[PDB]
Design a protein around this ligand. Structure first.
Ligand SMILES: *[C@@H]1O[C@H](CO)[C@@H](O)[C@H](O)[C@H]1NC(C)=O
Ligand SMILES: *[C@@H]1O[C@H](CO)[C@@H](O)[C@H](O)[C@H]1NC(C)=O
Ligand SMILES: *[C@@H]1O[C@H](CO)[C@@H](O)[C@H](O)[C@H]1NC(C)=O
Ligand SMILES: *[C@@H]1O[C@H](CO)[C@@H](O)[C@H](O)[C@H]1NC(C)=O
Ligand SMILES: *[C@@H]1O[C@H](CO)[C@@H](O)[C@H](O)[C@H]1NC(C)=O
Ligand SMILES: *[C@@H]1O[C@H](CO)[C@@H](O)[C@H](O)[C@H]1NC(C)=O
Ligand SMILES: *[C@@H]1O[C@H](CO)[C@@H](O)[C@H](O)[C@H]1NC(C)=O
Ligand SMILES: *[C@@H]1O[C@H](CO)[C@@H](O)[C@H](O)[C@H]1NC(C)=O
Ligand SMILES: *[C@@H]1O[C@H](CO)[C@@H](O)[C@H](O)[C@H]1NC(C)=O
Ligand SMILES: *[C@@H]1O[C@H](CO)[C@@H](O)[C@H](O)[C@H]1NC(C)=O
Ligand SMILES: *[C@@H]1O[C@H](CO)[C@@H](O)[C@H](O)[C@H]1NC(C)=O
Ligand SMILES: *[C@@H]1O[C@H](CO)[C@@H](O)[C@H](O)[C@H]1NC(C)=O
Lengths: 135, 135, 135
């Protein structure tokens, strides 16, 4: 990345801003902007690139061979009982939340067992989070 | 990365800002901006790049071979009972939260068993968090 | 990275700012800005790069071989009972939170078993945290 910007409200190169209930009288504004941008990003000069994978098996006895990749979830139990017994009561639940395994952003790249790779990998995440808002 | 910016409210190269209830009279503003940017990022000059992987097995006896990658979750139990018994009571739950395994940002890169790689890996995360807001 | 900036409210190269209830009279502002930026970042000059992995097995007897990567979670138990018995009572729970394994930012890079890599790895995280706000 080159230019990553997070701005809460207002982003401006030039901002002539006047707010409310304001007197803006007898103003002479002169502005000259000579802006130039030159970009040379991700230039590659490879005369020879070689990726080689070789597997050779000869008169071999293989048994009980197990290969497991990443992210192996096994024998997982969730138990969230919710028992509510009432007896001449006044129940007032305004905003009650029961969240189980809530995912917002899941970015996965090159999650493998055997990988051979060359170059650039980029991940960018921007957000403005707000889970619960009870007024 | 080159230029990473976090700004809460206002980002400006030039900001002529006037707020409320203001008198802005008899003003002469003159502005000249000669801005130049030159960027030479991620330039690679490789005459010869070689990646080599070789596996050779000869008259070999392999048994009980186990390979497990990362992120191995096994035999995980969650138990969150919620028993509520009422007897002539006044229940007032305004904002009650029960959160189990809540994920917001999960970025995964090159999570493997065997990896051969070359270059640049970049991860950028920006956020403005707010979980619970009870007014 | 080159330029990492965190700013709470206001970021400005030039800020002519006038607040409220202000008298701004008889002002002569003259501004000249000659700004130049030159960037030469991440330049690589490799005549020959070699990565080599070789495995050779000969008349070998292998047994009970176990390889486990990172992040191995096994036999994990969570138990959070919540028993509430009422008897002519007045329950007032404004903002009660029960959080179990709450993740906000999880960035993972090159979490492997065997890794061969070359270059640049960058991780940048910016946030403005606020978990609980009970007014
Ligand atoms: C604004 O400029 C004009 C022309 O220069 C002038 O006649 C006028 O009086 C100015 N305003 C005030 C409030 O003086
Ligand atoms: C920008 O404009 C102003 C306005 O008169 C002038 O004086 C200045 O020479 C200009 N600059 C360029 C680089 O054109
Ligand atoms: C890539 O092309 C040629 C061959 O290597 C080289 O002379 C040139 O300078 C390179 N270009 C850049 C932008 O580096
Ligand atoms: C391992 O080998 C034994 C006997 O050779 C077999 O009973 C067992 O099932 C094998 N393991 C697996 C996971 O299959
Ligand atoms: C603003 O400028 C004009 C012209 O120069 C002038 O006549 C006027 O009196 C000025 N304003 C005030 C409040 O003096
Ligand atoms: C910018 O503009 C002002 C306005 O008169 C001028 O005096 C100055 O020479 C200018 N500069 C350039 C670099 O153009
Ligand atoms: C890459 O290209 C040629 C070959 O190595 C070299 O002369 C040149 O200076 C390089 N370019 C840059 C921008 O470094
Ligand atoms: C290991 O080998 C024994 C006998 O050789 C077998 O019973 C067992 O199942 C093997 N282990 C696995 C995990 O399969
Ligand atoms: C502002 O400038 C003008 C012109 O130079 C002048 O006539 C006026 O009196 C000034 N303002 C005040 C409040 O003196
Ligand atoms: C910037 O502008 C001012 C305005 O008169 C001028 O005096 C100065 O020479 C200028 N500088 C450049 C570098 O252009
Ligand atoms: C890379 O390219 C050539 C080959 O090594 C070298 O002469 C040049 O100075 C290098 N470029 C940079 C920007 O260092
Ligand atoms: C280790 O070997 C014994 C006998 O050789 C076998 O019973 C056992 O299961 C092996 N271990 C594993 C983890 O398989």
């Amino acid at each position: 990345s080159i230019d990553v910007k997070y701005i809460g409200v207002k982003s401006a190169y030039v901002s002539y801003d006047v707010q409310k209930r304001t007197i803006y009288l007898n103003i002479t504004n002169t502005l000259n902007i000579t802006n130039n941008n030159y970009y040379s990003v991700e230039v590659e000069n490879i005369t020879a690139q070689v990726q080689f994978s070789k597997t050779v098996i000869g008169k071999a006895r293989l048994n009980n061979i197990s290969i497991i990749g990443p992210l192996d979830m096994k024998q997982i139990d969730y138990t969230v009982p919710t028992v509510i017994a009432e007896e001449m009561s006044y129940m007032y639940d305004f905003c009650t939340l029961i969240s189980i395994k809530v995912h917002n952003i899941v970015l996965m790249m090159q999650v493998t067992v055997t990988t051979t790779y060359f170059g650039h990998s980029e991940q960018i995440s921007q957000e403005r989070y707000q889970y619960v808002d009870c007024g």
